Amino acid sequence: YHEQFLKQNPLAVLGVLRDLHKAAIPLRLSWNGGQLISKLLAITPDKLVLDFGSQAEDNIAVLKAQHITITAETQGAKVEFTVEQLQQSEYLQLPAFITVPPPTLWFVLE
């Protein structure tokens, strides 16, 4: 993507994630081997909580992947960032992924 759409400092990155959480649009988690549909359930300055996919084998694959690309788009605007690790946690009595904010984020307003 054009470098125009790059968010680099942690305040700007978190600001986009806050908007993404409130918009509550679907996310796509992609790794070397597959993809699944998720959602940003919760956000703090230190953590992201992501919904499990519907297929258990996808969630297991995503828990051992070493890089995960997260995408979300609506009305011509796309969010894209990569995290290095997801772990399994709990949220509202269901399993969930936990990760941490990326150091950079793409907010592509093409």
C-alpha positions as a printed NumPy array, in Angstrom:
array([[  0.   ,   0.   ,   0.   ],
       [  0.973,   3.642,  -0.405],
       [  2.88 ,   4.904,   2.629],
       [  0.175,   7.571,   3.04 ],
       [ -2.028,   4.98 ,   4.774],
       [  0.568,   4.   ,   7.417],
       [ -0.047,   4.579,  11.126],
       [  3.183,   4.262,  13.093],
       [  3.025,   5.817,  16.545],
       [  1.082,   3.915,  19.242],
       [ -1.521,   6.659,  19.767],
       [ -2.521,   6.695,  16.092],
       [ -2.609,   2.883,  15.933],
       [ -4.819,   2.603,  19.015],
       [ -7.152,   5.302,  17.684],
       [ -7.969,   3.249,  14.59 ],
       [ -8.48 ,   0.119,  16.696],
       [-10.921,   2.001,  18.938],
       [-12.95 ,   2.975,  15.859],
       [-12.794,  -0.619,  14.584],
       [-14.101,  -1.988,  17.887],
       [-17.027,   0.461,  17.875],
       [-17.877,  -0.143,  14.203],
       [-18.089,  -3.887,  14.996],
       [-17.49 ,  -4.972,  11.398],
       [-16.167,  -8.468,  10.571],
       [-12.45 ,  -9.175,  10.594],
       [-10.514, -11.647,   8.476],
       [ -7.617, -13.491,  10.12 ],
       [ -5.216, -14.919,   7.539],
       [ -2.174, -17.14 ,   8.071],
       [  0.094, -19.416,   6.064],
       [ -2.475, -22.152,   5.489],
       [ -5.944, -20.643,   5.798],
       [ -8.262, -17.844,   6.884],
       [-11.235, -17.29 ,   9.188],
       [-13.836, -14.626,   9.982],
       [-13.623, -12.984,  13.413],
       [-14.466,  -9.726,  15.171],
       [-12.759,  -7.292,  17.578],
       [-14.609,  -8.063,  20.813],
       [-12.63 ,  -5.862,  23.201],
       [ -9.813,  -3.317,  23.128],
       [ -7.458,  -1.802,  25.725],
       [ -4.109,   0.01 ,  25.26 ],
       [ -2.426,  -3.333,  26.003],
       [ -4.64 ,  -6.025,  24.467],
       [ -6.992,  -7.048,  21.664],
       [ -9.633,  -9.745,  22.201],
       [-10.727, -11.493,  18.989],
       [-13.616, -13.893,  18.393],
       [-12.968, -17.528,  17.535],
       [-13.924, -18.746,  14.093],
       [-16.748, -21.228,  13.657],
       [-14.494, -24.145,  12.588],
       [-12.366, -25.596,  15.388],
       [ -9.524, -26.668,  13.093],
       [ -9.134, -23.057,  11.919],
       [ -8.759, -21.84 ,  15.502],
       [ -6.128, -24.494,  16.271],
       [ -4.236, -23.565,  13.095],
       [ -4.316, -19.88 ,  14.046],
       [ -2.989, -20.593,  17.546],
       [  0.233, -22.155,  16.197],
       [  0.785, -19.7  ,  13.339],
       [  3.783, -17.411,  13.681],
       [  2.34 , -14.444,  11.791],
       [ -1.334, -13.515,  11.423],
       [ -2.622, -10.792,   9.085],
       [ -5.836,  -9.066,  10.184],
       [ -8.021,  -7.277,   7.611],
       [-11.313,  -5.396,   7.807],
       [-13.05 ,  -3.148,   5.31 ],
       [-16.235,  -1.137,   4.869],
       [-17.318,   1.622,   2.465],
       [-13.951,   1.663,   0.698],
       [-11.771,   1.894,   3.831],
       [ -9.54 ,  -1.057,   4.746],
       [ -7.689,  -1.806,   7.983],
       [ -4.689,  -4.138,   7.745],
       [ -2.103,  -5.13 ,  10.345],
       [ -0.051,  -8.161,  11.353],
       [  0.509,  -9.697,  14.785],
       [  3.142, -12.255,  15.711],
       [  1.176, -14.478,  18.096],
       [ -2.313, -15.231,  19.363],
       [ -3.059, -17.081,  22.586],
       [ -6.307, -18.611,  23.794],
       [ -8.275, -16.767,  26.466],
       [-11.872, -16.253,  27.602],
       [-14.441, -13.525,  26.959],
       [-18.131, -13.497,  27.921],
       [-17.949, -17.245,  28.707],
       [-16.598, -18.19 ,  25.252],
       [-13.082, -18.958,  23.981],
       [-11.331, -16.04 ,  22.309],
       [ -7.973, -15.04 ,  20.867],
       [ -5.838, -12.518,  22.74 ],
       [ -3.038, -10.505,  21.155],
       [ -1.461,  -7.062,  21.576],
       [ -1.599,  -3.902,  19.428],
       [  0.695,  -3.967,  16.4  ],
       [  3.538,  -1.44 ,  16.157],
       [  2.168,  -0.283,  12.786],
       [ -1.234,  -0.396,  11.101],
       [ -2.552,   0.345,   7.608],
       [ -5.735,   2.438,   7.353],
       [ -6.167,   2.503,   3.574],
       [ -8.721,   5.099,   2.427],
       [ -8.229,   4.323,  -1.262]])
